[PDB]
Amino acid sequence: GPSVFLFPPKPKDTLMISRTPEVTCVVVDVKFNWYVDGVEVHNAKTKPREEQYNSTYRVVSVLTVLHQDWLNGKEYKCKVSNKALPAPIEKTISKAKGQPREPQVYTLPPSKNQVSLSCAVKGFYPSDIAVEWESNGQPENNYKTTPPVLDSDGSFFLVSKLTVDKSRWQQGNVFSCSVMHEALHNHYTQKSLSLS
Amino acid sequence: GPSVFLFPPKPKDTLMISRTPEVTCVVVDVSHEDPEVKFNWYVDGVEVHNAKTKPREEQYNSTYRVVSVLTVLHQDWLNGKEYKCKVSNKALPAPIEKTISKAKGQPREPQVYTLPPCRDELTKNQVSLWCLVKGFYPSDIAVEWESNGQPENNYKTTPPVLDSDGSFFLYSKLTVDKSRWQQGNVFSCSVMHEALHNHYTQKSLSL
Ligand SMILES: *[C@@H]1O[C@H](CO[C@@H]2O[C@@H](C)[C@@H](O)[C@@H](O)[C@@H]2O)[C@@H](O[C@@H]2O[C@H](CO)[C@@H](O[C@@H]3O[C@H](CO[C@H]4O[C@H](CO)[C@@H](O)[C@H](O)[C@@H]4O[C@@H]4O[C@H](CO)[C@@H](O[C@@H]5O[C@H](CO)[C@H](O)[C@H](O)[C@H]5O)[C@H](O)[C@H]4NC(C)=O)[C@@H](O)[C@H](O[C@H]4O[C@H](CO)[C@@H](O)[C@H](O)[C@@H]4O)[C@@H]3O)[C@H](O)[C@H]2NC(C)=O)[C@H](O)[C@H]1NC(C)=O
Ligand SMILES: *[C@@H]1O[C@H](CO[C@@H]2O[C@@H](C)[C@@H](O)[C@@H](O)[C@@H]2O)[C@@H](O[C@@H]2O[C@H](CO)[C@@H](O[C@@H]3O[C@H](CO[C@H]4O[C@H](CO)[C@@H](O)[C@H](O)[C@@H]4O[C@@H]4O[C@H](CO)[C@@H](O[C@@H]5O[C@H](CO)[C@H](O)[C@H](O)[C@H]5O)[C@H](O)[C@H]4NC(C)=O)[C@@H](O)[C@H](O[C@H]4O[C@H](CO)[C@@H](O)[C@H](O)[C@@H]4O)[C@@H]3O)[C@H](O)[C@H]2NC(C)=O)[C@H](O)[C@H]1NC(C)=O
């Protein structure tokens, strides 16, 4: 039997009008219809088959979606037709339902040749969020962010850890944690870090 | 046909000689027509004979589920031995095997740091105390909080996250009333992991 998975756009893509958010309908184990709420839609695009180490083909259909539709909770339905199973499989997907809540951002200074800078982001809803670090308006590359964790009041939290040379912290370059979320003004805040 | 799921001990069970660690082999979707289930267990490929298999139990979907439990020695688990469960049922073309063991790689000692609440979280009447734990391997770990020898239940802990040098980190958030914080009470983050001495460290924080 063929098997259908359906994936949401990336958080960052929906929050910035410049980027193009996509809903992806993956099919493992070998047609495509798309609806947004009721309405049938056409702009979807299939991909070159990606054969597998287990005699599987992986066929992927990508539909581009409007930022505002996704944010407003519209529902995306991927009806996969084929021969190797009778009834056309449906999957469906939409943004998590509920009042979006604004992340609260707080940077925390270190307690070797390297120090760990922390950015704790709490109290936000839905869990869709993107975190990034920069210095002198330049992107950092030595950072990792935990997945969102469900807090006891139903909001989410996470922490981002940025690792830099003890020396850069030393002079007092300023380090900046960017956070993007639907509940923030312009979908974007920043908190700032350096030593005192 | 049937399905097999094999589950490891909890981290805390292998790290404390007082607790008893177990590996658990669960078979579901056993049919009525072919209800007998046989388990064979192997440690590092050598058959063992002390597992305890429970009587089959009918589910509401009218399939059976059968469970076999094998107690493991703390040190076998920490020495990376491999536990295999082989399940035989007359509906299967061949027996199902699953194997499990501690994640492979050289253990690394966790570094535990506490981080106090920020100033600006001192307008609400709750504060957030932070216990960063990084540089550990493998990812099996247990993190808890206490004050005055009593556990603090109001905390949440991230899953271990794969760091870029191959170790793991996580943070734990403890939420307390701002008062308790300001009276200058002492909060304790406690961490259990194989690469710690006595498998257990403890870091404190207050004003
Ligand atoms: C034969 O093998 C194939 C292929 O498998 C791989 O390739 C071969 C060569 C071997 O090496 C395999 O071992 C490899 O795995 C098998 O295909 C697999 O089948 C699985 C079962 O049918 C299927 O299970 C489901 O997994 C879901 C998660 O899928 C995610 O995440 C994993 C990463 O861990 C990844 O493998 C998948 O591709 C998929 O990854 C996401 O892809 C989407 C789509 O593009 C990304 O989203 C988009 O990203 C773009 C940017 O690129 C853009 O941002 C778009 O906006 C955005 O939409 C997304 O970001 C990717 N994630 C990342 C970062 O990795 C699980 O959710 C799910 O579990 C759920 O349901 C289960 C029931 O099955 C429950 O158990 C569970 O609780 C959950 O509810 C599914 O189980 C595998 O994903 C699939 N692997 C792939 C590669 O597709 C095939 O099965 C096998 N045949 C058999 C049956 O023998
Ligand atoms: C017919 O019904 C059966 C039985 O189900 C119940 O009855 C039915 C009628 C319904 O009413 C249900 O509500 C009931 O649950 C169905 O059987 C299910 O099959 C599923 C696959 O079809 C299988 O899914 C897999 O589950 C794994 C998670 O299992 C955990 O977690 C869930 C809760 O999330 C839990 O329900 C399971 O019981 C199991 O719980 C763990 O139990 C272990 C073993 O005892 C515990 O381990 C021990 O713990 C003790 C202390 O207790 C000690 O510390 C020991 O040392 C230690 O070993 C552990 O603590 C428990 N954890 C939790 C969370 O409680 C998933 O891992 C797994 O995912 C993996 O496999 C996937 C492929 O399937 C991949 O996608 C994935 O990437 C992973 O690799 C599967 O999702 C269900 O577990 C199973 N339910 C039960 C009860 O076994 C049956 O499916 C249905 N049949 C039909 C035809 O409908």
Author numbering:
A (entry chain B): 237 to 266, 274 to 354, 360 to 444
B (entry chain A): 237 to 443
Quote from the publication.
In this work, we describe Format Chain Exchange (FORCE) as a high-throughput technology that enables efficient combinatorial generation of bispecific antibodies in different configurations for “screening in final format”. Educt molecules are knob-into-hole heterodimers of one half-antibody-like productive side and one knob or hole dummy Fc. The dummy associates with the knob or hole Fc of the productive side (covalently linked by hinge interchain disulfides) and thereby covers the CH3 interface.
Different mutations built into the knob or hole dummy chains lead to limited repulsions within CH3-interfaces, yet without affecting expression, purification or biophysical properties of educt molecules (described in detail in subsequent sections). The implemented changes include reverting in CH3 Cys354 and Cys349 (KiH interchain disulfide) back to the parent residues Ser354 and Tyr 349 on dummy knob and dummy hole, respectively. Thus, Fc-dummy heterodimers are flawed in that region because Cys354 and Cys349 on the productive sides are loose ends, not paired with their respective Cys counterparts as they are missing in dummy chains. Additional mutations introduced into the CH3 interface are charge-flip mutations between Glu and Lys at position 357 and 370 of the knob or hole dummies. These residues constitute an interchain salt bridge in regular CH3. The charge flip partially destabilizes the CH3 interface by replacing the 357–370 Glu-Lys salt bridge with equally charged and hence repulsive Lys-Lys or Glu-Glu pairs at those positions. Figure 2 shows the positions of these mutations in crystal structures of the resulting partially flawed Fc interfaces. Limited reduction of hinge disulfides initiates an exchange reaction between complementary educts driven by their partially destabilized interfaces. The reaction resolves the flawed CH3-educt interfaces to perfect complementarity in the products of the exchange reaction.
